[PDB]
Design a protein around this motif. Structure first.
Motif, PDB file in Angstrom:
ATOM      1  N   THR A  74       6.325  10.927  -4.276  1.00 46.22           N
ATOM      2  CA  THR A  74       7.294  11.151  -5.332  1.00 46.22           C
ATOM      3  C   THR A  74       8.104   9.917  -5.540  1.00 46.22           C
ATOM      4  O   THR A  74       8.426   9.303  -4.575  1.00 46.22           O
ATOM      5  CB  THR A  74       8.273  12.306  -4.988  1.00 46.22           C
ATOM      6  N   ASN A  75       8.518   9.645  -6.762  1.00 47.61           N
ATOM      7  CA  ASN A  75       9.262   8.436  -7.106  1.00 47.61           C
ATOM      8  C   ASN A  75      10.454   8.284  -6.225  1.00 47.61           C
ATOM      9  O   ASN A  75      11.283   9.124  -6.206  1.00 47.61           O
ATOM     10  CB  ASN A  75       9.738   8.586  -8.517  1.00 47.61           C
ATOM     11  N   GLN A  76      10.494   7.181  -5.491  1.00 45.74           N
ATOM     12  CA  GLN A  76      11.480   6.902  -4.512  1.00 45.74           C
ATOM     13  C   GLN A  76      11.543   5.401  -4.164  1.00 45.74           C
ATOM     14  O   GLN A  76      10.612   4.757  -4.224  1.00 45.74           O
ATOM     15  CB  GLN A  76      11.168   7.717  -3.255  1.00 45.74           C
ATOM     16  N   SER A  77      12.656   4.939  -3.709  1.00 41.87           N
ATOM     17  CA  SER A  77      12.873   3.536  -3.380  1.00 41.87           C
ATOM     18  C   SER A  77      12.645   3.328  -1.889  1.00 41.87           C
ATOM     19  O   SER A  77      13.419   3.819  -1.060  1.00 41.87           O
ATOM     20  CB  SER A  77      14.280   3.102  -3.783  1.00 41.87           C
ATOM     21  N   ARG A  78      11.581   2.607  -1.547  1.00 41.61           N
ATOM     22  CA  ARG A  78      11.228   2.315  -0.166  1.00 41.61           C
ATOM     23  C   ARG A  78      11.590   0.872   0.166  1.00 41.61           C
ATOM     24  O   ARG A  78      11.635   0.005  -0.710  1.00 41.61           O
ATOM     25  CB  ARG A  78       9.737   2.548   0.097  1.00 41.61           C
ATOM     26  N   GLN A  79      11.862   0.628   1.444  1.00 45.45           N
ATOM     27  CA  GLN A  79      12.311  -0.674   1.919  1.00 45.45           C
ATOM     28  C   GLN A  79      11.139  -1.477   2.470  1.00 45.45           C
ATOM     29  O   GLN A  79      10.401  -0.996   3.335  1.00 45.45           O
ATOM     30  CB  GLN A  79      13.387  -0.518   2.990  1.00 45.45           C
ATOM     31  N   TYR A  80      10.977  -2.699   1.967  1.00 40.67           N
ATOM     32  CA  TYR A  80       9.923  -3.603   2.404  1.00 40.67           C
ATOM     33  C   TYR A  80      10.515  -4.952   2.787  1.00 40.67           C
ATOM     34  O   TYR A  80      11.550  -5.368   2.260  1.00 40.67           O
ATOM     35  CB  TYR A  80       8.869  -3.800   1.311  1.00 40.67           C
ATOM     36  N   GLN A 127      14.382  -3.465  -1.688  1.00 39.84           N
ATOM     37  CA  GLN A 127      14.189  -2.069  -2.051  1.00 39.84           C
ATOM     38  C   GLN A 127      13.303  -2.021  -3.294  1.00 39.84           C
ATOM     39  O   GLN A 127      13.617  -2.657  -4.307  1.00 39.84           O
ATOM     40  CB  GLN A 127      15.536  -1.390  -2.302  1.00 39.84           C
ATOM     41  N   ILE A 128      12.195  -1.284  -3.210  1.00 44.08           N
ATOM     42  CA  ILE A 128      11.203  -1.199  -4.281  1.00 44.08           C
ATOM     43  C   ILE A 128      10.939   0.271  -4.575  1.00 44.08           C
ATOM     44  O   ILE A 128      10.563   1.029  -3.673  1.00 44.08           O
ATOM     45  CB  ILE A 128       9.885  -1.904  -3.914  1.00 44.08           C
ATOM     46  N   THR A 129      11.109   0.670  -5.833  1.00 40.77           N
ATOM     47  CA  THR A 129      10.840   2.045  -6.238  1.00 40.77           C
ATOM     48  C   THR A 129       9.336   2.248  -6.388  1.00 40.77           C
ATOM     49  O   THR A 129       8.692   1.581  -7.203  1.00 40.77           O
ATOM     50  CB  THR A 129      11.556   2.379  -7.543  1.00 40.77           C
ATOM     51  N   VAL A 130       8.778   3.163  -5.600  1.00 30.67           N
ATOM     52  CA  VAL A 130       7.345   3.428  -5.607  1.00 30.67           C
ATOM     53  C   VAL A 130       7.100   4.885  -5.977  1.00 30.67           C
ATOM     54  O   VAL A 130       7.925   5.767  -5.716  1.00 30.67           O
ATOM     55  CB  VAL A 130       6.693   3.091  -4.247  1.00 30.67           C
ATOM     56  N   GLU A 131       5.960   5.127  -6.621  1.00 26.67           N
ATOM     57  CA  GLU A 131       5.534   6.469  -6.984  1.00 26.67           C
ATOM     58  C   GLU A 131       4.013   6.521  -6.989  1.00 26.67           C
ATOM     59  O   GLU A 131       3.357   5.564  -7.404  1.00 26.67           O
ATOM     60  CB  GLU A 131       6.079   6.873  -8.358  1.00 26.67           C
ATOM     61  N   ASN A 132       3.459   7.639  -6.520  1.00 23.00           N
ATOM     62  CA  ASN A 132       2.008   7.830  -6.540  1.00 23.00           C
ATOM     63  C   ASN A 132       1.744   9.324  -6.708  1.00 23.00           C
ATOM     64  O   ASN A 132       1.746  10.069  -5.725  1.00 23.00           O
ATOM     65  CB  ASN A 132       1.359   7.278  -5.278  1.00 23.00           C
ATOM     66  N   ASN A 133       1.522   9.747  -7.952  1.00 20.64           N
ATOM     67  CA  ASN A 133       1.267  11.145  -8.274  1.00 20.64           C
ATOM     68  C   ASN A 133      -0.201  11.533  -8.131  1.00 20.64           C
ATOM     69  O   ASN A 133      -0.591  12.606  -8.604  1.00 20.64           O
ATOM     70  CB  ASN A 133       1.733  11.462  -9.700  1.00 20.64           C
ATOM     71  N   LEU A 155       0.836  -1.191   0.000  1.00 21.86           N
ATOM     72  CA  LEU A 155       0.000   0.000   0.000  1.00 21.86           C
ATOM     73  C   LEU A 155       0.875   1.247   0.000  1.00 21.86           C
ATOM     74  O   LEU A 155       1.747   1.402   0.860  1.00 21.86           O
ATOM     75  CB  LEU A 155      -0.943   0.012   1.201  1.00 21.86           C
ATOM     76  N   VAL A 156       0.628   2.131  -0.964  1.00 19.43           N
ATOM     77  CA  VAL A 156       1.379   3.370  -1.135  1.00 19.43           C
ATOM     78  C   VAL A 156       0.405   4.525  -0.954  1.00 19.43           C
ATOM     79  O   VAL A 156      -0.604   4.608  -1.665  1.00 19.43           O
ATOM     80  CB  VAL A 156       2.068   3.434  -2.507  1.00 19.43           C
ATOM     81  N   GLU A 157       0.707   5.411  -0.003  1.00 16.52           N
ATOM     82  CA  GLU A 157      -0.169   6.527   0.322  1.00 16.52           C
ATOM     83  C   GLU A 157      -0.211   7.546  -0.819  1.00 16.52           C
ATOM     84  O   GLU A 157       0.643   7.532  -1.709  1.00 16.52           O
ATOM     85  CB  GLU A 157       0.291   7.189   1.622  1.00 16.52           C
ATOM     86  N   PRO A 158      -1.214   8.428  -0.829  1.00 16.95           N
ATOM     87  CA  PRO A 158      -1.301   9.421  -1.904  1.00 16.95           C
ATOM     88  C   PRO A 158      -0.115  10.370  -1.892  1.00 16.95           C
ATOM     89  O   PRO A 158       0.529  10.597  -0.865  1.00 16.95           O
ATOM     90  CB  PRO A 158      -2.604  10.172  -1.597  1.00 16.95           C
TER      91      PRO A 158
END
Length: 159
Positions: free
Chosen positions: A49-55, A63-69, A43-46
Motif C-alpha cells: 500500500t502507498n507508503q513512505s519507506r526509508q532507504y 524517505q521514498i513513497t512506494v506503492e505496489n498494488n 526492490l518493492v515486494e508485492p
C-alpha cells in the motif's frame, strides 16, 4: 551465464549486463560516477500500500513513497543528475521474475523497465561512463551485450 557473484562494490566493464538476482525487498543497486549520474534500484515486494519507506542511498537517509498494488515485484529506478538534488522515480520494472539489469554502454547507463514478460531496455546519458561504480547489494550474474537477447530472456521469464 557467468555464475553467481556475491554482493560487492565494483566498476562493471562496459558492454556487460549485470543481472541482479535479489530475494527480498531492498536497495539492490547504487551506481554513480559522483559527477552527473546517480542511479538506484529499490526492490518493492508485492502488495504494498502507498507508503513512505526509508532507504539509504549513497550514504544519505531518504524517505521514498512506494506503492505496489500487484502480485508482482516492482523495481523503483531512482535517479538524479546532481548530488545536490533529490532522487526522482524515473522508471519502474514490474516483474514476476525478480531479476533486474544494469549495463554500461556507449556513454549511457542501461536498465530494464516495463512489465514482464514484455520488459524492455532504456538508458540515461552520462559524460563520464567509465567512472560509474556500482554497489550491488545482492547476488548477480554477468552477461555480455553480445548475448543481450539471452539477458532479455532471463529478465522476462527467469533463469
Amino acid at each position: 551465464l557467468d555464475g553467481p557473484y556475491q554482493s560487492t562494490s565494483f566498476k562493471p566493464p562496459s558492454d556487460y549486463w549485470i543481472l541482479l538476482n535479489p530475494t527480498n525487498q531492498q536497495v539492490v543497486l547504487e551506481g554513480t560516477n559522483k559527477t552527473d549520474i546517480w542511479v538506484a534500484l529499490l526492490l518493492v515486494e508485492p502488495n504494498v500500500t502507498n507508503q513512505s519507506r526509508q532507504y539509504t542511498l549513497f550514504g544519505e537517509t531518504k524517505q521514498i513513497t512506494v506503492e505496489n498494488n500487484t502480485n508482482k515485484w516492482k523495481f523503483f529506478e531512482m535517479f538524479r543528475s546532481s548530488v545536490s538534488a533529490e532522487f526522482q522515480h524515473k522508471r519502474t520494472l514490474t516483474s514476476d521474475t525478480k531479476l533486474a539489469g544494469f549495463l554500461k554502454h556507449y556513454n549511457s547507463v542501461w536498465t530494464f523497465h516495463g512489465e514482464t514478460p514484455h520488459a524492455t531496455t532504456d538508458y540515461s546519458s552520462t559524460s563520464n561512463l567509465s567512472e560509474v561504480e556500482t554497489t550491488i547489494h545482492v547476488e548477480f550474474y554477468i552477461i555480455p551485450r553480445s548475448q543481450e537477447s539471452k539477458c532479455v530472456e532471463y529478465i522476462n521469464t527467469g533463469l
